Structure formats: C-alpha cells, structure tokens
Design a protein around this ligand. Structure first.
Ligand SMILES: Cc1ccncc1NC(=O)C[C@@]12CCC[C@@H]1C2
Ligand SMILES: Cc1ccncc1NC(=O)C[C@@]12CCC[C@@H]1C2
Lengths: 304, 304
C-alpha cells in the first residue's frame, strides 16, 4: 500500500546521456547506437535566438565543430543532419550501453519520466504528464535542453520527449525524437500562445481508484451520473470530456474495486462542485491528473 | 524554472539490486562489494511473523539455503550473519557495478529517494522524507522489502534506508544499512504505535523560497514575526519548532531572494491561520514539507 508519483528507474537512460557543445552553447544529447540526438538550437548564439535561420547556421558548421563528450570520452563526429528541430550527429562508436528502445509520439494526457540533465550529467528524475495543450510543467534550467522523457516496458525504453524550450510563462515545450514539436511551438525566443489547458479527466478518475484501493474512501457517495450529465460539469470546470474509450480504459480498476466508472464520475462531480472541504486524498489537497489508468494498475500490482 | 519532487537518478542503485530467496520468501537484497544486505525477515514463514525467534530461525539456515540472483546470474553464498534486523550474505564475487558508497543514518525531516523493487527488479523511483516520527509514507507492496533509500553526492551513493515493514496503518518502517530501525519499530507482525507526527517546518519554509524563486509570490505579506511568536503558531498547527539552526540552514535562500527568514515565517503563519483560500503554490494545494533547504538549492541551481 501507499501511492506515490513514481518515475521509471532512469538507469537505462543515464547510460545514453552525453554533452554536446557547438561554439559557446552546451546542452545534452542522447546517444543511441552510433547516433547522438540533440536540440538544433545548440548551433545558435544570442543574436540568432529571436528568429534563427537554422539551415543557414548549420551550413557554417562542420562535423568537427560539434564536441560530444560521454563524461570521460570524446566521441568522433562523422556526420551531422537536421531532422525537424533535432540534430542527429553520427558518431564512429556505437554506445555500448544502448538499451532496447523505440521512438514514440505520446498523446496529450499520457505520462512519462524526465531525466533532467546538465552538461550531459543527470541531476534527477521526475514523473510528469503531457498537458492536453502539449506543454509540460517540468523543472528545467538553462543547460537542461536535450534532457529526455521516456517510458519503460520491461526492458525497452520508449523515448517520447526531448526538452527544447521554456515559454515566457515558465511552462515547458519540446519535441518527439524525430524533432517534431508537441503543440504549436517553434524553437524561437518569442512569446507563444499555448492552448487553453484542461484537467485530464480519465487520469483524475484513475487516481480516485488508486485512492480507494489504498484506503482514502471519504469521497465515495450515494450517487451515480451519466456521461452527458458528467460532461456538463467537466465543461464548467475545464476538464476533458469523458468518452466510452476512457470508461473502457478504466475497466480493470472498476473491476478490481467493484465501483462502476459512472459511480466514480459522480464522486468526481461532487468534488468539483463542493471541493475537498479541507480534506486530502493520497496526500493531495487537489485532484491529481498525472496518473494514467495504466500507471495506477502498474503501481498497485508491482509491475517491474 | 519549474519545481518538481525530483528523485536522484537511480542507475547506480539499480546495478546493486539483487533477489534473495530463503524457503518460500523472496525479497530484495543490496549487493555492494562481496556482501548482499537484506531484511532478516526473509528467513520467516507466516507462523513465525507474529513474534519470530530470529536467532533460532537463522540457526536452521545454511549458506546454500539463501538463493541470491542478480537477474541472470546466481551468486555463491560463502557466509551469512545477522546484524540487528539485516542479514549480510557474503558472496564469492564482488559486484562489478559497485559505486562509491557510504552507509548513513539520516535524521528525521531529511529527504531521500527510494528505488522500489520486486524480485530484485526495479519498478520505480520516488522522493520522500523521513517523518519526524521515523516513518515514511511510501509505496510498498508485498515483495518490496529490501528496497533501499539513498542520496547521491556527485558520484558517491549514501544509503540511508532499507524497507522492512508496513504498519497496520499503511505507513512504512525500515532500518539504516546496519539493520537498526528508525523509530521504535520491531520487525514483528503486530500493531505498533508510531509517534505523534509533525510537519517539517524548515522544509515548508525552504519550499516557500522555491515558490518565490519560481514565480509563486501571492503568499508574501506586509508582516514579520519572531521565533517565539512563530513557534506558538507552529505548536497549535503541529509543526516542528523552528530553531536558529533551521534559520541558519535557510541562509542561502534568504540571501538569494532577499526575504528574511522571519518574514517568510510570517507568510507561513498567515497560511497556517487562513489556509490557501482555494489557491495553489508550486502546483500544490497544501504546504509541502518534502523538500529540504539543500534540495531547494540543488534543484534551483542545477547540481548534477
Ligand atoms: C533557458 C531555458 C530554461 C529552461 N528550458 C529551456 C531553456 N532554453 C530555451 O528556451 C532556449 C530557446 C529559446 C530560443 C530558441 C531555444 C529554445
Ligand atoms: C506486506 C508488506 C507490504 C509492504 N511493505 C512491507 C510488507 N511486509 C511486512 O510488513 C512484513 C513484516 C511483518 C512481520 C515481520 C516483517 C515486517
């Protein structure tokens, strides 16, 4: 028992972290096989940042200008290319620590662990969610660009995120491992509108099930609701509309606990309308939305 | 910017995790040099659990009865001994993945990362605090015993905790790496009183500084207080009494932000007396106490 915002063990990813320098800029790179991936803004200087001409800047760079260091050793760069907003530096040595891996594009509302790095060195690991508006509320300082987000299924690391930018609002933006930004963001030092965010309803429901499994039951009530009635409340409180697909994914939790998904929806409805009344659920005084139904099952059963 | 409940990267600890079996029981062990450490209750059966005679049970066990597996390989046990509530199994092979390490006894109120494991395999990593009453509110299921708590200073892992038990209340109890329980707990399946817990005041203050550094400022006010006046409020709200030693440790944060520690104490006093008024601080709707002043400085500066 007990429920925590658990991150995946970061070992397999730590062995992939390298430092990438180009001119004055140093950031993090991801070394997999004989390729190092990093944000393309490593080639910029402060004068470029407002609106960099990435193709033009990269043309002034040669393989020898990209300094790649895996802690103690220097990697020899034999090729460079820009794919979307990432640079792929072909090195002459395959990373001996390369785990089984996949590059995946996650959906908004899904969760992942971030291994925050500085100068190719890991400082910490935290679990977070891709917001419905494609931003992440992370912890990133200058130098952390290139730090990656990932999930682990047994021994295979699915890399889903690479950090690129902090918006003027202090929220974070990044790309998949093919360099495509999540959301409407561009890698420029400009004010950029992030979409209207919403709370990930399916995740809040999954977390309410985790609470029941672990003893916090005070919020359970004598009521039920419908998808339509619940979605009217979710609309008012800026929550993601719940669909039968979300009800379906909550099936194992509904089955384990015997609490019908719509009955849990009714508990959520009363919590949205009345608040917590100074009480807590799993150590939180708000409705947590960074645990997917998959995260709840995995943690509640001991999946390694 | 951004502030997260960050855990240390778990790589160095993952390479130390092994599986220990004795009879029907399987739990986790920590392999450092040529020694495997694990909770001594691995030698019990359900009939023993109410009040095991550990010395008597261990006498019925030989080196060959302790099955130690480091994932793929079986370790040869050449010695066994019980030190307090831990068993130390001498193996014929030193762990090639042994990092620089220390065994430390942490103080209540200090924080650390837990690498939750099952059958010698890591499932996740989370940051937590040793409560003033020596319990930890973790996430541990059956089989997680032997999972360890630790801190990392550059390349040296300081192991501070080994998980042993879940109290009837669902709170967790464990030992240092010499097998000494934190708190008054004994490794028996009995109801055991945990002391009256309190909120770690110095940590809440450190977290209020992290909030200011990262933009959340609404709670700052036109007031100041004294240690005596503040401690009267802390007494009423079951918070740890603040001392000049705590004020001293908050020095770097007071210096960085220009907010005198007693002025921050006055903001905390008003938050205790009035609540959050439906607002949040760093994504939380309560006063967070799992970040030490050291954690705040490390995270706010990018220490790897
Ligand atoms: C300073 C910082 C802190 C945390 N996370 C990211 C950053 N860096 C940036 O945002 C750099 C830029 C803006 C210009 C193009 C390139 C993305
Ligand atoms: C079942 C479980 C779940 C999570 N954390 C720990 C446990 N296990 C125990 O508490 C076992 C005992 C009680 C008897 C002696 C030995 C400590």
């Amino acid at each position: 028992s007990g429920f925590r915002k658990m991150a995946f063990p970061s070992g397999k990813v730590e062995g992939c972290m390298v430092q990438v320098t180009c001119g004055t800029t140093t950031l993090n790179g991801l070394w997999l096989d004989d390729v190092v991936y990093c944000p393309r803004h490593v080639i910029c200087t402060s004068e470029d940042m407002l609106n960099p001409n990435y193709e033009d800047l990269l043309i002034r760079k040669s393989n020898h200008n990209f300094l790649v260091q895996a802690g103690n050793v220097q990697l020899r760069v034999i090729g460079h290319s820009m794919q979307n907003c990432v640079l792929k530096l072909k090195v002459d040595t395959a990373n001996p620590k390369t785990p089984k891996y996949k590059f995946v594009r996650i959906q908004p509302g899904q969760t992942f662990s971030v291994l925050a790095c500085y100068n190719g060195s890991p400082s910490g690991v935290y679990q977070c969610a891709m917001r419905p508006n494609f931003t992440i509320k992370g912890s990133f300082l200058n130098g952390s660009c290139g730090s990656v987000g990932f999930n682990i299924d047994y021994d295979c690391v699915s890399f889903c995120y690479m950090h690129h930018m902090e918006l003027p609002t202090g929220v974070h933006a990044g790309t998949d491992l093919e360099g495509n930004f999540y959301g409407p963001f561009v890698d420029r030092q400009t004010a950029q509108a992030a979409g209207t965010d919403t709370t990930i309803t399916v995740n809040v429901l999954a977390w309410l099930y985790a609470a029941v499994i672990n003893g916090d039951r005070w919020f359970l009530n004598r009521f039920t609701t419908t998808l339509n009635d619940f979605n009217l409340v979710a609309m008012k409180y800026n929550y993601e509309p719940l669909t039968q697909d979300h009800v379906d994914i909550l099936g194992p939790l509904s089955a384990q606990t015997g609490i019908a998904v719509l009955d849990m929806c009714a508990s959520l409805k009363e919590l949205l309308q009345n608040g917590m009344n100074g009480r807590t659920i799993l150590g939180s005084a708000l409705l947590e939305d960074e645990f997917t139904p998959f995260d709840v099952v995995r943690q509640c059963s001991g999946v390694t």
